[PDB]
Amino acid sequence: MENAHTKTVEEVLGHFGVNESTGLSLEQVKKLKERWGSNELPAEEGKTLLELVIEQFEDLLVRILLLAACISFVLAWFEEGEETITAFVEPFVILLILVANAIVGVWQERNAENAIEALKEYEPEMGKVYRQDRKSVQRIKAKDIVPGDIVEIAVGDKVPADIRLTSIKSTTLRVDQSILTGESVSVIKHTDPVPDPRAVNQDKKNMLFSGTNIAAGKAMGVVVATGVNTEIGKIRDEMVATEQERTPLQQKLDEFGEQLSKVISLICIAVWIINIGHFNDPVHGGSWIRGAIYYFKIAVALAVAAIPEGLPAVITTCLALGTRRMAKKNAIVRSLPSVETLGCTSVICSDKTGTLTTNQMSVCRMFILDRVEGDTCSLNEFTITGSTYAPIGEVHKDDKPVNCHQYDGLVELATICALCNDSALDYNEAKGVYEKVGEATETALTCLVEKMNVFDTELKGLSKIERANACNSVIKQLMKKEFTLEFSRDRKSMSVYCTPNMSKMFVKGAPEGVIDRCTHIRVGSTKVPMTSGVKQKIMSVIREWGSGSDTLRCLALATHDNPLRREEMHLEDSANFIKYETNLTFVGCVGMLDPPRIEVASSVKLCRQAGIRVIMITGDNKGTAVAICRRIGIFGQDEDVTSKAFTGREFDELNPSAQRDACLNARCFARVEPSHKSKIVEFLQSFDEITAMTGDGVNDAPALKKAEIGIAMGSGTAVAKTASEMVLADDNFSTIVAAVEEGRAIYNNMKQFIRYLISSNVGEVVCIFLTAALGFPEALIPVQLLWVNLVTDGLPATALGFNPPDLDIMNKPPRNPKEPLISGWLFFRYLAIGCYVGAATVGAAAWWFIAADGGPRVSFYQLSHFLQCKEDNPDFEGVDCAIFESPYPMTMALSVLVTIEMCNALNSLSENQSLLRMPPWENIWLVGSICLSMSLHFLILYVEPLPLIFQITPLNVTQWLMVLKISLPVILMDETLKFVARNYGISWPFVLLIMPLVIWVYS
Ligand code: BEF
Ligand SMILES: [Mg+2]
């Protein structure tokens, strides 16, 4: 059935061959079940571990590490011996690191997926269908419903499938469509057909879409769509069809990996070129194509040694710690790199109903008659706190808490509110929240009566389930509730007959429609003749409440003291209801709205400080949307919103330049379709802006998946939590701001341990290449370089992730999405450091061979030509040949490298802040990890079996002083670089602590 809302009830009944009185037969049931199938959405679940690891290995850095591992493995295989375990130890540990990284990623993904399934009420879905089996209604599962079934639905049940309304058993039918359309107020439904074929879901007032629940009434209709043919099913298909890009952090890491691969391949071909033509010698060869094999084998090994190994491990550790700190704030993050996304977010789009506001109408204002002076009056006004259905808030007259017992008008108002409504407020122990039973605009009055204790009952001893309806129960016990005159659209009010345990008729309705019938005023306990001045004053106050800064749904409450008895009452016709209440006594009025969350007003301001633009994209009308915008702080109370607030059509009828100016300056989009939100998010991203979308409904699912990060509310639909990358399990909007902080800190710290590692490694390159150029004996060998790069470069690089965040971190605009991790300057700035690690280490070794007392004081010629020392005495008159394999210079080089790395982790605490102004004890984890790395290095020296694995031997005090002399100037070098970076001794205890070391070392 196509466009069932455009066709009358008779023809849509005949198209399916179903009679509204009888229903469907089991034959037709099976005939439709075999075609359409089950009425449920296809479940998409997390993939197996293998397909998760496949995407864990999608990072370019992990691919580079795996390529380097395979290369070093096929290079270690050139040796005929298969038992060379010292050569295969490097690819094995690289593979272990990569496998651990992938396992941690998969574990985080699975833990996040499991934490979101707990935010799902395990409720069975049922429906009431009229089939030809039995005459009475049949309660069956909604999965078995097929297009054509007659479905009967009453107040308080979810709509099982798309239903074309055939008959309304009650006078009116009110449905809550906040899930699909985002409307805060319930919609009145009618069986009349809608002429527009391409009408939006809000214009379809004869259809009941799936997932929505009935607020009030009872009706019967015909199913027209099931499964994926429903509206929510179409929205889920549109969500699944949307594309999913890579997070900004993943893009930055891919760019850095491309730069790294360009660097690694550069030094390889450079060494190959500078060493080509150097194998024309006959030694171990004799050809040119054969000469490019040994030099290639050494150059590729050098280039692989240039690559950092613990970088993805420390990145994953930092991201996982960030995810843990966010989950401690009730925020479920699916992916690791999504923790940084809110740090670089420029625009935060947000749904209104349920996301920015609660979905729980609450009375926030009220007023009664305090005094009367003649042709005028005085209005006693109160404001009530509380933005949910929980009866916890308080009432304040002007600014101070007051008791409503002294006021008789407030007692009458509470009586009217508790007796005129037919809704209720229950408590769900499973979710621990209070919920409504009927319409929201009557649960508001129920919670109001529960808030203002007019009888001063004691609710402290009562439990939560009894505290939900205690005061209403007391008021109902005091006055018995007789028949209720049904609400009529012409009279625009509803009344209730009441006889105490004389007769009073309590009327509740629209302000003007009710006040046009009130002829007297209740002031305290006194009846007073009504005049035009009182009327115009009350009407002006209502118009002030009904619009302006506070757009409130207003409700007038009156009483009838002398009504005619039920004997003279005639309830056959609806038109007698208004004439039965021609004379009324105005008691007061109340004003309720869909209140924003209590954490949104400060959150929009904090996001404004951090440079984030908040946009509201909602399906509700522009009135309520702009009201909530002015309330939370997006707009001002008097700010013109002519070119800052749009609708769906008002945005569609704009030219591309107009749409550009809108997306660049608008802040409120109202009455938008689920595809309109995706269009807005796509435009905001087309303007090169990392976009964040927050939502709780199905209509947000196509948008939450389009944004770089999509945040869903913990109470929202399952589709929204499916399309989202973050989930606020506690419906706390302020948490988002907190998240924006972490993604700002983490990334900063990230850059730190991306430099401190990278620079370190290039040092171990300049140490080797120079040793190949000068011809000196090998100072640093890969077996100890692996231990360095892992242990003494992962503990400081991990502790550098705990750096204290900046003081103005949340006071600056988001970072430019175009700038890379390693800039030009920060490139040079590390090259220098790398060079210093190349010149020092080698030098240290040479020192032990030239100037050390214990070492053989050979000449530079004898040092560079140690290959000729194998001969007895060509030029080496007394020096030993075995001494060129001594472990003392190798230990000197290793200790110098480790000490330079410790000092470089020391002065890597901040990018530009000097070590004097920011002492190292600011990050106690950094100094702790430095102590641990030095302790593990000394462990390598003085334990029994490990000094045999690494060709190193312990030192003495003089050689350690020399190591310090060689290594410490790296701090001066980095301080000079930081000074140059800033321009183009605040901590005096640190200075007086380091002066002994400097004077003792350079004594
Ligand atoms: F829930 Be939103 F206002 F579409
Ligand atoms: Mg919503």
Helical spans, DSSP H, in 16-164: 26-33, 49-56, 60-76, 85-117
- Do 688 and 778 sit in the same domain of this protein? no
Atom of ligand 1 nearest to the CA of 181: 4
What is d(CA 316, CA 282) in angstroms, rounded to the nearest whole number? 50
> 117 — phi, psi (to 5°)?
-65, -20
Atom of ligand 1 nearest to the CA of 184: 3
CA atoms within 13 A on the CB side of 171: 11
Quick one: angle between helices 674-686 and 231-241, nearest 10? 20
Q: Is the minimum distance from the CB of 619 to ligand 1 under 6 angstroms?
A: yes
With respect to residue 184, please indicate whether it lies within any of the assigned structural domains.
no
* Helix pair 957-967, 988-1001: axis angle to 10 deg: 130
Question: What counts of helices (H) and strands (E) characterise the chain?
Answer: 33, 29
Instruction: Return the CATH number at 422.
Output: 3.40.1110.10
Whether residue 660 lies inside any domain: the answer is yes
User: 358: Cβ below 6 Å to ligand 1?
Assistant: no
144 is catalytic: no
Q: Is residue 325 part of a domain?
A: no
Does residue 10 sit within a domain? no
Residue 851 placed within a domain: yes
Same domain, 724 and 611: yes
Q: Show the domain range for 630.
A: 341-357+598-732
Instruction: Give the three-state DSSP class for 692.
Output: strand
Spatial distance between the Cα atoms of 608 and 627, rounded to a whole number of angstroms: 19
Q: What is the largest CA-CA distance in the chain?
A: 137
CB of 699 sitting under 6 A from ligand 1: yes
Q: Which of 355, 669, 717 to mutate to test the pocket of ligand 1 (most atoms within 8 A of CB)?
A: 355
Say if residue 449 is in the same domain as residue 568: yes
Locate 835 and state its tokens. 């060079």
Q: Which of 531, 555, 588 is the last residue of a domain?
A: 588
Mark whether 513 and 539 lie in a shared domain.
Answer: yes
d(CA 541, CA 645): 27
Q: Is the CB of 974 under 6 A from ligand 1?
A: no
Residues 420 and 353 in one domain: no
CATH of the domain at 902: 1.20.1110.10
Strand order in the sheet with 126-130: 138-141, 126-130, 150-154, 218-225, 162-168, 207-208
Same-domain status, 613 and 518: no
Please tell me which residue in 59, 149, 176, 351 is annotated as part of the active site: 351
Place of tokens 């050098």: 302
**Where is the binding site for ATP, in residues?**
353, 442, 489, 508, 553, 618-620, 671, 677, 699
Q: Are residues 980 and 875 in the same domain?
A: yes
Task: Looking at the structure, tell me whether residues 540 and 637 fall in a common domain.
Answer: no
User: Does 70 reside within a domain?
Assistant: no
- Say whether 21 sits in a helix, a strand or coil: coil
Distance of CA 238 to the CA centre of its chain: 21
Residue 553 and residue 646 in one domain? no
Same domain, 727 and 604: yes
Task: Give the number of domains in the chain.
Answer: 3
- Give the torsion sign (CA, 143, 146, 152, 153): positive
DSSP result, 462-517: S-HHHHTSHHHHHHHHHEEEEEEEEEETTTTEEEEEEEE---EEEEEE-HHHHHTT
Experimental resolution (Å): 3.1
Q: Choose the final residue of a domain: 709, 732, 755.
A: 732
- What is the CATH number for 675? 3.40.50.1000
Breakpoints of the chain, after residues (C–N > 2.5 Å): 501, 984
- Which residues on neighbouring strands pair with residue 591, listed in sequence order? 365, 554
Q: Which of 231, 351, 711 to mutate to test the pocket of ligand 1 (most atoms within 8 A of CB)?
A: 351
Q: Is residue 882 part of a domain?
A: yes
| Residue 581 DSSP class | T
Q: Is 967 in the pocket of ligand 1 (CB under 6 A)?
A: no
DSSP code string of 169-180:
SSS-EEEE-TTT
Domain shared by 851 and 948, yes or no: yes
Closest ligand 1 atom to Cα of 620 = 3
With CA atoms as reference, report the closest residue to 814 among 718, 675, 690. Answer: 690
Ligand (nearest to CA of 703): 1
* Residue 676 alpha carbon to ligand 1 centre in Å: 12
Tell me the C-alpha distance between 745 and 228, whole Å. Answer: 43
Whether 206 is in a domain gets the answer no
Question: 995 and 859 in one domain?
Answer: yes
- Which of 694, 710, 732 marks a domain boundary? 732
